[PDB]
Amino acid sequence: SAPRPCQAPQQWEGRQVMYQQSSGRNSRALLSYDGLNQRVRVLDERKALIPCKRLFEYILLYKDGVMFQIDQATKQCSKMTLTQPWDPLDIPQNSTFEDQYSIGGPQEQITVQEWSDRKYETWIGIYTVKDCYPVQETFTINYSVILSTRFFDIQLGIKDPSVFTPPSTCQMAQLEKMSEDC
Amino acid sequence: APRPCQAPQQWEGRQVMYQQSSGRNSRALLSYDGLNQRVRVLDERKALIPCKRLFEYILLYKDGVMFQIDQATKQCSKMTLTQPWDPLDIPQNSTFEDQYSIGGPQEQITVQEWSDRKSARSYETWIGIYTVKDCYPVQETFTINYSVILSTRFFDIQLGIKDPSVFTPPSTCQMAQLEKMSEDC
Numbered sequence: 001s002a003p004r005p006c007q008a009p010q011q012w013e014g015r016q017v018m019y020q021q022s023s024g025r026n027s028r029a030l031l032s033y034d035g036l037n038q039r040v041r042v043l044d045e046r047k048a049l050i051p052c053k054r055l056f057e058y059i060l061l062y063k064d065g066v067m068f069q070i071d072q073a074t075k076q077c078s079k080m081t082l083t084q085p086w087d088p089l090d091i092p093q094n095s096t097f098e099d100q101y102s103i104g105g106p107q108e109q110i111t112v113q114e115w116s117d118r119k120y121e122t123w124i125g126i127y128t129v130k131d132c133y134p135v136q137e138t139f140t141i142n143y144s145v146i147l148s149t150r151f152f153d154i155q156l157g158i159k160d161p162s163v164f165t166p167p168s169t170c171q172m173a174q175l176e177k178m179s180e181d182c
Numbered sequence: 183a184p185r186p187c188q189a190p191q192q193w194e195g196r197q198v199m200y201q202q203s204s205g206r207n208s209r210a211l212l213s214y215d216g217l218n219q220r221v222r223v224l225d226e227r228k229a230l231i232p233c234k235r236l237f238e239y240i241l242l243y244k245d246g247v248m249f250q251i252d253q254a255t256k257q258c259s260k261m262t263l264t265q266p267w268d269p270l271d272i273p274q275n276s277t278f279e280d281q282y283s284i285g286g287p288q289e290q291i292t293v294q295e296w297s298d299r300k301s302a303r304s305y306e307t308w309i310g311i312y313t314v315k316d317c318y319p320v321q322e323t324f325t326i327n328y329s330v331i332l333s334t335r336f337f338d339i340q341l342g343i344k345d346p347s348v349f350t351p352p353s354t355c356q357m358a359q360l361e362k363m364s365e366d367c
Contacts (some may be wrong), residue, residue, distance in 0.1 A: 015282070021205060024329030047279065051328060067367070098228070101337035103284065103291065105318030109284045114336075135285030143232065144205035152282035152293075 006132035008090040010035035014154035038062040052182035062086040077173030184278045187317035189271040191216035195339035214267040219243040233367035243267040258358035272296045
C-alpha cells in the first residue's frame with residue numbers, strides 16, 4: 001500500500017521565516033497558531049539592524065472577519081477586513097504524496113514528507129514523519145512561487161492566550177492599512 | 183560566541199533549487215566533491231506536467247569548464263567557467279545569525295544560520311543553514327540587495343562519493359557544442 005496523511009498539531013507557537021516573491025524578501029517573525037480557534041498572531045523580528053523594516057504585530061481572527069495590524073512602537077492600529085477564507089496548517093486527506101526526504105545527515109536527522117494538495121494555485125507542504133510537525137509551506141501559481149514559509153522552534157499549545165486579544169488602540173482604529181517602511 | 187563547524191567536503195544527495203529569475207523550483211541529484219573542486223547534478227522531473235527536458239551538468243572548476251548534457255540524446259555543451267569556486271561550508275569570516283530547531287520535540291535537529299555577506303563590492307549576501315552537531319548543509323541562499331536571487335535545499339545526504347565515474351563526461355563531451363542549448367520541449 002501507499003502512505004496515509006498524518007494529523008498536524010493544531011495548537012502551537014514557534015518562529016517563522018516567510019519568503020514572498022512580491023517583495024522578493026524574507027521576513028522573520030514569532031508565530032502563534034491556534035487552529036482550534038481559527039486564529040493566528042505573528043510578531044515581526046528584525047534580523048540585523050540593516051533594513052529598518054518597522055516591526056509590526058498582526059492578529060488574524062477568522063471566526064470574525066478581521067485582522068489588526070499594530071505598530072510595535074506606537075501601538076497604533078489598523079483594522080483590515082479578511083476576505084479569503086481560513087486555510088489550516090495541516091495536510092488534507094485529498095492531498096497527494098510527492099516525496100519523503102531526510103534533512104541533515106547520517107548521525108542527526110529527521111524524516112519528512114512532501115505532500116501536494118494543488119488547492120491553478122497549487123499548495124505543497126512538508127511535514128515530519130514521526131509526529132507531523134510542519135517544516136515548510138509553499139503556495140505557487142502556475143508553477144512559480146508566490147509565497148513560501150519555514151517553521152521552527154515549535155512547542156505545542158499556547159502559553160499566554162492574551163496574544164490574541166488586541167490592544168486598547170484597536171477599539172476604534174483606522175480602516176486603511178499602514179506602511180512598512182522607515 | 184559560536185565558532186563555525188566544519189562541513190563534510192564529500193557527499194551526495196538531492197537538491198531543490200529555487201531561482202528567482204525563473205521563479206521556480208527544480209529537483210535534482212547532487213554529487214558534491216569539494217576536495218576535488220567539482221560538482222555534478224542530475225535533473226529530476228516532479229510530475230509529467232512541465233516537459234522541462236532533463237539535463238545533467240558536470241562542473242570541473244580545476245579545469246575551469248562545465249558540460250551540459252541532454253539526458254535523452256546525450257548531446258553536450260562546453261561552457262567556460264567564470265566565477266570562482268565557492269565550497270559548501272561556513273567560512274571563518276562569517277557572522278552567526280540564529281539557531282533554530284526543525285520539526286518538533288523528540289524528532290528534531292538543531293541548526294545554525296550563518297551569514298558571510300561576501301561583498302566583492304556589490305553587497306551580495308550569502309546565508310547558509312548548517313546542522314549543529316556535525317555541520318551537514320540543509321540550506322543555502324544567495325541574495326543581492328536583500329532580494330532572493332537563488333536558494334537551494336539539500337537532503338538525503340550520504341558521505342563520500344559511491345561511483346566517481348559520474349564526474350567523467352560522456353564520450354560526446356570530448357568536443358562539445360561550445361554554446362548554450364535550450365531546456366524546453
